[PDB]
Design an enzyme around this catalytic site. Structure first.
Site, PDB file in Angstrom:
ATOM      1  N   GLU A 105       0.806  -1.218   0.000  1.00 20.49           N
ATOM      2  CA  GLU A 105       0.000   0.000   0.000  1.00 20.49           C
ATOM      3  C   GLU A 105       0.843   1.273   0.000  1.00 20.49           C
ATOM      4  O   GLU A 105       0.417   2.304  -0.523  1.00 20.49           O
ATOM      5  CB  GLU A 105      -0.948  -0.002   1.200  1.00 20.49           C
ATOM      6  CG  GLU A 105      -2.282   0.668   0.923  1.00 20.49           C
ATOM      7  CD  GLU A 105      -3.432  -0.023   1.627  1.00 20.49           C
ATOM      8  OE1 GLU A 105      -3.266  -0.396   2.808  1.00 20.49           O
ATOM      9  OE2 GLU A 105      -4.495  -0.203   0.998  1.00 20.49           O
ATOM     10  N   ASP A 157      -5.650  12.313   2.488  1.00 23.24           N
ATOM     11  CA  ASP A 157      -6.293  11.222   1.766  1.00 23.24           C
ATOM     12  C   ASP A 157      -7.178  11.765   0.648  1.00 23.24           C
ATOM     13  O   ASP A 157      -7.128  12.952   0.325  1.00 23.24           O
ATOM     14  CB  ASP A 157      -7.110  10.344   2.719  1.00 23.24           C
ATOM     15  CG  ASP A 157      -7.969  11.153   3.676  1.00 23.24           C
ATOM     16  OD1 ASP A 157      -8.275  12.323   3.370  1.00 23.24           O
ATOM     17  OD2 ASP A 157      -8.341  10.610   4.739  1.00 23.24           O
TER      18      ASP A 157
END
Ligand SMILES: N#Cc1cc(Cl)cc(-c2cc(-c3ccc(F)cn3)ncn2)c1
Ligand SMILES: CCCCCCCC/C=C\CCCCCCCC(=O)O
Ligand SMILES: CCCCCCCC/C=C\CCCCCCCC(=O)O
Ligand SMILES: CCCCCCCC/C=C\CCCCCCCC(=O)O
Ligand SMILES: CCCCCCCC/C=C\CCCCCCCC(=O)O
Length: 408
Positions: free
Chosen positions: A121, A130
């Site tokens: 990831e 984000d």
């Protein structure tokens, strides 16, 4: 004679002896059981030398009341202080090395999954956002939901323990990651579709499942109904074949191939990713307590003041008490840390419960004993209760399994 006082109207010294006698009998029973069945997985999977030291400390514990209840001799005053001091130090300092070892193993487990998602990831060593604009750092670790860039830095410093200035390290990123893992495990166990699967898988394959959760979410993973059933029935090859057909495999092939492979083998192949030492350390921690006891023998020579009253002052009691308090404190610390660890039929759940009570018993002991006008008897019961708890919560369950469940 303890019977004499019982007939004079004082049943305290006869009760402490019977307590101690039943204690020695129970410890003798448990000890013989482990000698005979030393090769049974319930005993073999744990440190067997450490257990003997724990059992010896409990034995000496019950023997203490025979030194508090005895004919007025000089060396019995010596045996009291040696007994009340070293006996907890033998059991607890052997137990802490066991818990510490369980804590290191667990920490190394969280190390592997951290490397797994660092590769799958990614990782950022400074603050970012984000897809929804919230401040984030490391492996997708949310810091705050305030638009303030200053707010994220303040939350970060509280979590790391220093002035980071928005920049952390790989280790500090792992620190934050450990939380997110524990948070993810909580959700899985509260998910009816993911809980039975998670309970059946080994340590490695559980990381692979968490990996899928960190990519697709819990609602997403629950979609793999058939594949989850295959994994639960330990049909790895079929699960793999089944997972290679998903849209997930086709949308993110590189990562999905590594996760599936982890399911197949139960190893870390798809990722680049001492017993004697324990006895020595335990031996050292026990010698430190003895050094305290011997030093207090020199500073304050024991002397006779059924009941055997010794001239043992407060310092003669407090100093070995405090050191044993440290041992108990360290035990409980690592025991709590590994409370959910399921090794040896959830052995760690029993060790944690013992230390919970032990902490309470020993903390309650201080105002009770030092405020008592019946110290010898109060000491007798405190010692035996302390020894009974460690014997009943840690060994009795294993003895029960070994005698009543030979098929388990
Ligand atoms: N001052 C004081 C003091 C206070 C208390 Cl509450 C217990 C004890 C104790 C505990 C054990 C002992 C031994 C093995 C085990 F597993 C647990 N406790 N053996 C002797 N004395 C000493
Ligand atoms: C099983 C039961 C065994 C436990 C205890 C029985 C022995 C009690 C001994 C107390 C005797 C004291 C005395 O002789 O004065
Ligand atoms: C059987 C069990 C026997 C226990 C005997 C010990 C009782 C007396 C010892 C303490 C004392 O000296 O008064
Ligand atoms: C168990 C035996 C272990 C240690 C006993 C040693 C005690 C000797 C310390 C000296 C006593 C003193 O100086 O009066
Ligand atoms: C939870 C771990 C075990 C419990 C901690 C052990 C407690 C011992 C530590 C300190 C006790 C305080 C000092 C003794 C008070 C002296 C009382 C007096 O003599 O008047």
């Amino acid at each position: 004679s303890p019977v004499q006082y019982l007939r004079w109207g004082d049943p305290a010294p006869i009760a402490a002896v019977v307590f101690a006698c039943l204690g020695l009998l129970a410890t003798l029973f448990v000890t013989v059981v482990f000698i005979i069945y030393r090769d049974t997985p319930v005993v073999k999977s744990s440190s067997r030398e450490l257990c003997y030291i724990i059992l010896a400390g409990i034995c000496l514990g019950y023997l203490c009341t025979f030194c508090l209840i005895a004919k007025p001799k000089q060396i019995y005053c010596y045996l009291q202080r040696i007994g009340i001091g070293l006996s907890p130090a033998m059991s607890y300092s052997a137990l802490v090395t066991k818990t510490y070892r369980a804590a290191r193993i667990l920490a190394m487990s969280k190390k592997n999954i951290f490397e797994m998602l660092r590769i799958d990831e990614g990782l950022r060593l400074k603050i970012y956002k984000d897809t929804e604009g919230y401040y984030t750092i490391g492996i997708g670790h949310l810091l705050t939901k305030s638009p303030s860039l200053n707010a994220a830095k303040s939350e970060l410093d509280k979590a790391i323990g220093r002035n980071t200035n928005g920049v952390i390290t790989k280790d500090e990123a792992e620190k934050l990651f450990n939380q997110d893992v524990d948070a993810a495990v909580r959700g899985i166990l509260r998910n009816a579709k993911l809980k039975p699967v998670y309970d059946s898988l080994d340590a490695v394959r559980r990381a692979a499942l968490i990996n899928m959760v960190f990519q697709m979410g819990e609602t997403g993973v629950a979609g793999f109904t058939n594949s989850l059933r295959m994994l639960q029935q330990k049909r790895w090859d079929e699960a793999a074949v089944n997972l290679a057909k998903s849209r997930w495999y086709n949308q993110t092939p590189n990562r999905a191939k590594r996760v599936i492979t982890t399911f197949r083998t139960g190893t870390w192949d798809a990722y680049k990713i001492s017993a004697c030492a324990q006895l020595v350390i335990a031996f050292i921690l026990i010698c430190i307590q003895l050094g305290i006891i011997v030093a207090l023998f020199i500073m304050e020579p024991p002397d006779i003041m059924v009941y055997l009253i010794c001239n043992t002052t407060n310092l003669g009691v407090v100093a070995p008490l405090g050191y044993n308090g440290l041992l108990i404190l360290a035990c409980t610390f690592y025991a709590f840390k590994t409370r959910n660890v399921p090794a040896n039929f959830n052995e760690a759940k029993y060790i944690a419960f013992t230390m919970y009570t032990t902490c309470i018993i020993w903390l309650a002991f201080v105002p009770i004993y030092f405020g008592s006008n019946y110290k010898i008897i109060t000491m007798c019961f405190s010692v035996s209760l302390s020894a009974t708890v460690a014997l009943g919560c840690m060994f009795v369950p294993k003895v029960y399994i070994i005698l009543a469940k030979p098929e388990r």
